[PDB]
Symmetry: D3
Subunit: 279 residues, 6 copies
């Protein structure tokens, strides 16, 4: 399995540069009509789920003969401030689409509308009827990885075989989620990447599609990423800190998490602050 | 007037059997794609409105030369825990349709969406223009029974004669409400009956329509009902206790009643918990 | 004893004030609450009938039906019963400092489960959810009814660190009232300048007489009941209507909302009062 | 510039007449299917913004060689009780349309749905792209009056010239807002005017259009207005007092203002009380 | 007496700090609140102008307009007036324990109706909604203005159980300040390490001098006013701007929301403080 | 001193109770909370790992990784860290009067920033956000970490009206525990009838021994930890699992919601308890 470059050194922007880049991110969100976010495992590290390629990442530790460490189970994990900031950005109509490589189920469990989300690598809580393609979002992890039989049968009125949604190394991306992600990415005038190294094709390349027809690209990550050279703005810090400052400049609160909830469909936007005068 | 079998003895499932049947009801709600509820006077007894055929029912007492007793007026009556649990089940998209034989106005006053409700026997708070068929939901009971003239005139811009909506013994069921009820009942994969003896045609037979094409039928009642033999599950207890345990297993709170409110149209579902793994 | 016990006057005819008289009496009750510095409420089984608990001496009361060879009807268990609008209005009146004390003959546990502060409540006849250590007198408020009546052994033992025998708090016919609850009820009743009675026939001694103590030194007495009561002649105002309708109108005149019930909750101690509307000019 | 009749004496209905007229207004709102409100500068005087023609109005003071006095800036001004009562009336589906002559931005900043609002004289917070006609609702006043260049450029993906939306004396009314106002006014069965002298054509005449095909007209103002003779009901008092009593009779609370918020689109109505029996 | 009464300097020119100076002064006010252990606020009629109550000595003040033969303008009645953003910011500052005491010259009743705790408020000039028993000194907070000015008989009688004559609390020109309110204001002012004045010209003795007591033993004084005030020279910081804009920016720097107003409410007694943000490092 | 300092047993193997045993132990913990009159919690670095703060002696602990020549990893700064479900469950347990005292070895500041009342909290090892006047002992809770460790001068001066030198509160290896916090922890621990330890290995003297004081005069001890702890043999119940999973199940059995975190807030003093569910019958 090609696991790419693992355990690169972290970069930390010093405070004054950090504060000034988040103001510039604010400016781009205000100026943009179609904003798409791309998330990876870096946005879940602050709730106790290790990443893949970070200092204590899954791959990084296995390369050194060590184990990844979980400070939580998938079921007891709480969405981060970043997760909840993405919920609110979608509710006030500032986020058009969310593209995620994470199988951790937290975006769905955060209350984020599934019809605005592409889970490119599947969802550990989601099993899907082989025949009728009906998905079930379960309250516990389904039990298998690699699109195998879970043991359970479809209940739609069918008795179809339910399989997990976790892609194995050689498994192709779900076409609907990839097509929705690719469509949102081409149409975006701003793509913001959060805690991904962007080292996986084609997930990691979707943000680049935004640069075609003059879109802007922002990369928020602690480590270098595959596409650092193509970004108009790279922010080297904790995504929780970036997103709490961004939300403060936008005049938005980060909503409370009520515990695990499934929203199928986005609502019309809630009221949002009026926009600053720019330049 | 055929008043059927009145004052049958109550049945109480003992606690362990009761707890186990409500878990089975939970399982059927989770497994079902289209759930229809049928309510009668048993769901209003806990707010001080007597039923018809129960031990102290209207008919039961008149058969013995006694009076029904009200512990409230129709106007001061509050929706029960069961009423409010039905509001929440509809808001989170677990209830497709509600079919009620009650004229007590509480489902509407509970905030329940009128476009998901069939009031088969009319509403004591609702008067309707003879000519333009415009309904008014009033804050007090309209004053007459049997589709007579209330005294008031239509205000749409008409001066049509306003009549009560309470069917007398020989009066046919409103076709729109009966057609919507019959349609929801045939399409349901689960019908749950709450505090009805099911002794009235065709209201009491609508739940049976669900058994055609393999639907399941659940009867919640203290007394035997006309159709006990056709049920996959009969729960003999207080509907308030059944529904508060059901809501607990589903991970749903019973919302506060803000006082009397009219919602014409259902909204898209609110977020709900993810589903348990079954079998 | 229990069989022969005097159950008083049962099944007396109900009275309904007509709407204009009813509307005018609730306005007068509002006026007396506004004018009063110490308001004490006395409740009985009439305030619980609208949540499916039958009363004792009403048309379908427990004693009334027994007299006719019939059974009373429950539309709920004690555990699944919800406090009425009246219960929740009393919670709010205490929170905004307009109720000084609450004196109740009810064993139905709903005042405590409503969230009403126990240090402002006298449960004269006990509480079906409450057991008490014979040894150290520590009370436990349970989530289910305790099991026994008549100050008997429940089966459970005290857990204070004692292992005392736990007993129910339900008075049998010949059992004396708890001294502390009677002394606090009697103290609040003498000091009240307004006593309001809700859904009691006031037929039991001394529970039913406590409201009269308010009339000494010029206190005013208000009786809210569908039936006549033992002390109708001593009342400055008698309201014949459903307590839920009286209390929801009263709360509307006072500018107070009836708070939501979160499900069963035990509050031991009252807080300082919440803000309340300013008072009308009365003259 | 024709500034009409300025500084007319105020009229105050005495309390018993005042209370009785607001009950009659309540009755007309209950009886009406399409209610349109017309607002002018009188509904903003209670938040410290002077009117034009009132005792201390802009024009009235300039006629006497004095200045208008502001007790607030446009940015720090809070919507009045009347503003917030109009928000709630629209949310519960009792207000069809709102027509405003005010440039003070408070209706938008109150959270009122822009697709139900006609700002006939423009909005001091709103600038608009000369070319693509895209509007921006800014957090501060834009800086110019009379449809001039603000200095800023369009950001839609264009670089169009942004202009203020404030009509000068000779500038024609925006056709879309005037057409929506005129359409709502003809279709209304009740028009209620709040704190306008109705002295400006065609804004001040729109309410009269309601009287065609038998609509009712209510004028709430402290001074005489151009069209007093055409009203079925004239209420001489503070609009805050009229609207707080009206809201009390309707059983509606006046919602909290969360600070400045932009809602583009109206939602389906929230639940509302059932209606009184009338006559 | 009333006709000849010295109404001081009326209609002095307004001052507007330009935006960058204004932004920097509010940051400095934030810093002084953070650094201070005892913060006392002094309010006058300037904090009520944004809800439609004209002031006394502003460009359109009551006295200013009288001097020019003109009338002041009300955009509201006293009863329909809503507390400003400033009123509600003072409520929150008291709730989170950052305001020790509030001293007000206003008779407009809005501080009380805002829900501000009366035991932390000195109403130096009285309250138009408040009448007081001549006999027993019991105050009543009414929902409408009481009717009279100058400590006269209102017409109503006391209801404590007294039948005392009820009088308004509005001081006439020659009437002495209530001793209790002056002594509590004077005590809080001497003990304050920060006094902030909002919308008063500080021209009235001794109300306008209380803030100076803070300067003794090294207290800091902040004056927020659109016009010059009697004591501008003694201030460590003078902010020339709209009080609503100053207080909404100050609350933003402090990390505090301005709470919703529920409509008119009377709170007699302050609660323990609510949680508040932790303090910035200052050096 | 610091280099040679005994860092105890680091990187001991993790234990996971299987789900049925885990479910049954949390039910037993629920039972002990219900049965107990004085419940004291002892927390350490294990309750902060789920918000991205590594512990000391866990598999990736600070000391564990140092032993292997590796670095610990932070997924957050101290300032951007959010309190865990466990932190917020402890807030609620204190609010409903089911937690008497909280004793913590953590310097991460999250208990204070969670809104937990400081007068019920002993921070045995100090708080990175808290500096203290050398002269007058006045503490300041800052919005950012103070800058220094080992009771050194921060650079700032006291603002009480004093100009005392402000020092950090972080104990160095040889620094004695603050007397007041140790005496209040020791007092609560002796008087507890239940001590529950969450995410501490209990290896530090005397912090790690305080829970044992509860076992004297028949107190019960519960240890919640993924690894063995120094005092496993003295525990009446050891739960080997994630503290977030244990505490969310415990709160579910108790009928309590885990309240929302508003962002960083300092509460100095506890309030009277909020209402809580009535207790199950246990026998
Ligand atoms: N709090 C944080 N803030 C900012 N950046 C962070 C944080 N925590 C970690 N990082 C950075 O977060 C980045 C995480 O990058 P990777 O670990 O490759 O995760 P992926 O989502 O991109 O991997 C995609 C797929 O690859 C796998 O095979 C699976 O199939 C995954 O689905 C690093 O650069 C960290 O520095
Ligand atoms: N709390 C309770 N929980 C459970 N069951 C209950 C409860 N209370 C009563 N019951 C049961 O509730 C059942 C109520 O049955 P019926 O009284 O016939 O009412 P309907 O709605 O079916 O009557 C339909 C029409 O008939 C009339 O002519 C009118 O036109 C009505 O509209 C009994 O079996 C009770 O045991
Ligand atoms: N919804 C209602 N609204 C108003 N009044 C009502 C309502 N329902 C009933 N009432 C009236 O409520 C009144 C209730 O009177 P009683 O039934 O004697 O109850 P107690 O609490 O005074 O019985 C005292 C003790 O006696 C026993 O032996 C036990 O020991 C009790 O503790 C009636 O007059 C009804 O008209
Ligand atoms: N609180 C109040 N309650 C009731 N009436 C009020 C109140 N305050 C003021 N009034 C009355 O409010 C009325 C305000 O009338 P005008 O001042 O002409 O404002 P417009 O909106 O109609 O002027 C329209 C345009 O004319 C300009 O050129 C601009 O272009 C404006 O856009 C008076 O009769 C006051 O008595
Ligand atoms: N919105 C505003 N923002 C800021 N400052 C303001 C505002 N509006 C007005 N001001 C300023 O607010 C200041 C208000 O000063 P004065 O009008 O003398 O009121 P007092 O409360 O001190 O009068 C004291 C007593 O005197 C009387 O005789 C009664 O007895 C009073 O109780 C002005 O300088 C305005 O610039
Ligand atoms: N999410 C989790 N859930 C449950 N247990 C956990 C979790 N994460 C870690 N643990 C356990 O949490 C335990 C934490 O034990 P230690 O790391 O020694 O921390 P202390 O607070 O007791 O260190 C005391 C002092 O020593 C220092 O020198 C400083 O001065 C400290 O103040 C481990 O056994 C983990 O298994
Ligand atoms: N709102 C309220 O407070 C409220 C209202 C009603 C009730 C109520 O009905 N509870 O049961 C008490 C009861 C029932 C029957 C008998 S008769 C009897 C006698 C002997 C036996 N073995 C069985 C029944 C006896 C009593 F007192 F007579 F025993 C007592 C409780 C509380
Ligand atoms: N909601 C409202 O009622 C409301 C009230 C006022 C306003 C508002 O400010 N609009 O401009 C009107 C205006 C202002 C000043 C002058 S005089 C002037 C202007 C600028 C300078 N530099 C000097 C004098 C003149 C006018 F017409 F007299 F010129 C006209 C907007 C809304
Ligand atoms: N925010 C505030 O606190 C506030 C602001 C303004 C006001 C205010 O305007 N209230 O009326 C007081 C008043 C008005 C006119 C006169 S002149 C007069 C004299 C004699 C008669 N008969 C009538 C009017 C006299 C006063 F003091 F001079 F009498 C007193 C009240 C409160
Ligand atoms: N949840 C919690 O409470 C929590 C968990 C973890 C931590 C934590 O990691 N904080 O830093 C303390 C620390 C780090 C390294 C060293 S080693 C060292 C020695 C000398 C220098 N100059 C630098 C590093 C030393 C210490 F103690 F050894 F110094 C102390 C803090 C709090
Ligand atoms: Zn299938
Ligand atoms: Zn009609
Ligand atoms: Zn005991
Ligand atoms: Zn453009
Ligand atoms: Zn008196
Ligand atoms: Zn000091």
């Amino acid at each position: 399995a090609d696991k790419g470059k693992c355990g690169l050194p972290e970069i930390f922007d010093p405070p004054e540069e950090l504060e000034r880049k988040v103001w510039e991110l604010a400016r781009l969100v205000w100026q943009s009509s179609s904003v798409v976010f791309h998330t990876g495992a870096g946005i879940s590290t602050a709730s106790g789920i290790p990443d893949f390629r970070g200092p204590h990442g899954v791959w990084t530790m296995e390369e050194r003969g060590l184990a990844p460490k979980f400070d939580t189970t998938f079921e007891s994990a709480r969405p981060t401030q970043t997760h909840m900031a993405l919920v609110q950005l979608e509710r006030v109509g500032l986020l058009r689409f969310l593209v995620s490589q994470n199988v951790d189920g937290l975006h769905v469990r955060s209350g984020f509308p599934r019809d605005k989300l592409a889970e490119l690598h599947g969802n550990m809580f989601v099993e899907e009827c082989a025949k009728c393609k009906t998905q079930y979002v379960r309250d516990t992890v389904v039990g298998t990885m690699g699109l195998k039989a879970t043991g359970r049968l479809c209940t739609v009125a069918c008795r179809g075989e339910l399989r997990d949604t976790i892609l194995d190394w050689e498994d192709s991306l779900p076409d609907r989620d990839l097509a929705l992600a690719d469509e949102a990415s081409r149409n975006a005038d701003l793509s913001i990447t959060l805690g991904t190294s962007l080292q996986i094709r084609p997930s990691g390349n979707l943000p680049l599609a935004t640069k075609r027809r003059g879109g802007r690209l922002v990369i928020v990550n602690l480590q270098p990423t595959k596409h650092d050279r193509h970004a108009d703005l790279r922010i080297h810090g904790y995504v929780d800190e970036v997103m709490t400052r961004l939300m403060k400049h936008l005049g938005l609160e980060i909503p409370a998490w009520d515990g695990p909830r499934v929203l199928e469909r986005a609502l019309p936007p809630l009221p949002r602050p009026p926009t600053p005068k720019l330049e």
